[PDB]
Write a protein that binds this ligand. Structure first.
Ligand SMILES: COc1ccc2c(c1)CC(C)(C)c1c(N)ncnc1-2
Length: 346
């Protein structure tokens, strides 16, 4: 049985061959990543005399079209950030090769989940968490510029990459599930652990869903573990409620899916539907998850510099603003960047 004239496997992936030359230009060196979309290779661009990463999309219409959306959004972001100051991966060019769409990027290092694994899932320092937060809020500010108005829709540690393994510089990747405000099509979006309450509830959404994901990512970067690790949507909402309490009635009153998770009482207040058993609503305090007064996560930052009670209070406050249940009042990128968590003291 033959796929794409022998170039592909049965899963429509290009069969990567070390050393192959493409288009009298690229020498494929090695495979450096693989996922649902296809594969990522390190290649030498002989024309520009530099290493590049080529994302080789599966030869399958659904994957091709997902990557064509990504190409258009990255090209739009390109028109608007030529100095590469806003922390989005740079798409150099694209081409079709042997029935695979191929996206050529600058070569980056490993992702923030790999970085968490490298900490043995104990987390990075509050200082490094702050550097990641500042860069991500800058990226979100750029995506919110009106000519872009891009909702990434799948922010998670795996979609944030280090530029260099020694260093704090990061880029956001993977715009295949993205969309623009006023061209919102998807009802089902975001990876579960990072999914906002408005999406869980079946409500209208906007760029604020990415800020929710960022709040979740930053707590996980410092603790080593996902903040809200739901096994399914009901479990996800229940985990959110353990930390943040029952969502506001004004929100639940307008939520198409309120009754998937909650019940409306005679007095018009809302409670959780019973299990078929969680910490009571709001009793799993972020204050304690972060260890604000008790030496940080697991008490492991006791006796370390750069981890004071005062700095933990600033981090907690910023995260709580990113995790506001109301997407209208949730902190926005411009104001997050001005928050006291980013103000130096001492
Ligand atoms: C499994 O998913 C992966 C694996 C590796 C990478 C990406 C996705 C994203 C891109 C293609 C942007 C990239 C890069 N530019 N440099 C290095 N690695 C990667």
């Amino acid at each position: 049985k033959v796929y794409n004239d022998g170039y592909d496997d049965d899963n429509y992936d290009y069969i990567v061959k070390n050393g192959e030359k493409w288009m009298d230009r690229y020498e494929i060196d090695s495979l450096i990543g693989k996922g649902s979309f296809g594969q990522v290779v390190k290649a030498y661009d002989r024309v520009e005399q530099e290493w590049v990463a080529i994302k080789i999309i599966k030869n399958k219409k659904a994957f091709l079209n997902q990557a064509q959306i990504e190409v258009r959004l990255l090209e739009l972001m390109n028109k608007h950030d030529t100095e590469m100051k806003y922390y989005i991966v740079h798409l150099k060019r694209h081409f079709m090769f042997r029935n695979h769409l191929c996206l050529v990027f600058e070569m980056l290092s490993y992702n923030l989940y790999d970085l968490l694994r490298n900490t043995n899932f104990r987390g990075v320092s509050l200082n490094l968490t702050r550097k990641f937060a500042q860069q991500m809020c800058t990226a979100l500010l750029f995506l919110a510029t009106p000519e872009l108005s891009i909702i990434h829709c799948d922010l998670k540690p795996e979609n944030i990459l280090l530029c260099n393994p020694k260093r704090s510089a990061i880029k956001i990747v993977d715009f295949g599930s993205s969309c623009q405000l006023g061209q919102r099509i998807y009802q089902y979006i975001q990876s579960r652990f990072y999914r906002s309450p408005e999406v869980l509830l079946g409500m209208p959404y906007d760029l604020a869903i990415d800020m929710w994901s960022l709040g979740c990512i930053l707590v996980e970067m410092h603790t080593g573990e996902p903040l809200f690790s739901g096994a399914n949507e009901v479990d996800q909402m229940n985990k959110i409620v353990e930390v943040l309490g029952i969502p506001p009635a004004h929100i639940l009153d307008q939520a198409p899916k309120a009754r998937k998770f909650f019940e409306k009482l005679p007095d018009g207040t809302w409670n959780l539907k019973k299990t078929k058993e969680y910490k009571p609503p709001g009793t799993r305090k972020l204050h304690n998850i972060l260890g604000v007064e008790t030496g940080g996560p697991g008490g492991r930052r006791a006796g370390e510099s750069g981890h004071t009670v005062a700095d933990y209070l600033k981090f907690k406050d910023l995260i709580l603003r990113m995790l506001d249940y109301d997407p209208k009042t949730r902190i926005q990128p411009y104001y997050a960047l001005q928050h006291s968590f980013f103000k130096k003291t001492a």
